[PDB]
Amino acid sequence: VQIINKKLDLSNVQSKCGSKDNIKHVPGGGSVQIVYKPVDLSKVTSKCGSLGNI
Amino acid sequence: VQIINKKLDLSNVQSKCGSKDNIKHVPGGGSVQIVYKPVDLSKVTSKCGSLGNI
Amino acid sequence: VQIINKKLDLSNVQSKCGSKDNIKHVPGGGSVQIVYKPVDLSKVTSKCGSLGNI
C-alpha cells in the first residue's frame, strides 16, 4: 500500500538564474497590473574544464 | 498496490535561465494586464572542455 | 497492482533558457491583456569540446 520515492540527485548546474516573467498568476477580479518599459540587460558567463559525474 | 518512483538524476546544465514570459496565467475576470515595451538584451556565454557523464 | 516509474536521467544541456511567450493561459472572462512592442535582442553563445555520455 506504499508510496516510495527513492530519489537520488547528483545533477550539476554551473550558473543558475530564476525566471524573469513580467505579469504572472493573477486570480484578482477587476484588478490592474502594469509593467512599464522593463529591460533585461544581464550578462552570464560560464567557463568550465570538465562538468559532469563519473 | 505500491507507487514507486526510484528517480536517479545525473543531468548536467552549464548555464540555466528560467522563462521570460510577458503575461501568464490570468483567471481574474474583468482584470487588465499591460506589459509596455518589454526588452530582452541579455547575453549568455557558456564555454566547456567536456560536458557529460561517464 | 503497482505503478513503477524507475527513471534514470543522464541528460546534458550546455545553455538552457525557458520560454518567452507574450500572452499565455487566460481563463479570465472580460479581461484585457496587452503586450505592446515586445523585443528580444538577446544573444546565446555555447562552445564545447565534447558534449555527451560514455
UniProtKB/Swiss-Prot annotation, chains A, B, C:
Disulfide bonds join 17-48. The modification N6-acetyllysine is found at residues 7, 16, 24, 37, 43, 47. Promotes microtubule assembly and stability, and might be involved in the establishment and maintenance of neuronal polarity. The C-terminus binds axonal microtubules while the N-terminus binds neural plasma membrane components, suggesting that tau functions as a linker protein between both. Axonal polarity is predetermined by TAU/MAPT localization (in the neuronal cell) in the domain of the cell body defined by the centrosome. The short isoforms allow plasticity of the cytoskeleton whereas the longer isoforms may preferentially play a role in its stabilization. The lineage of its organism: Eukaryota, Metazoa, Chordata, Craniata, Vertebrata. This is Microtubule-associated protein tau. The chain holds residues 592 to 645 of 758 of the full protein. Changing residue 22 to H: In FTD1; reduced the ability of tau to promote microtubule assembly without having a significant effect on tau filament formation; effects at both the RNA and the protein level. There is a cross-link at residues 7, 24, 37, 43, 47 (Glycyl lysine isopeptide (Lys-Gly) (interchain with G-Cter in ubiquitin)). The record marks 16, 20, 24, 37, 43, 47 as: Not glycated. Changing residue 46 to F: In PIDB; markedly reduced ability of tau to promote microtubule assembly.
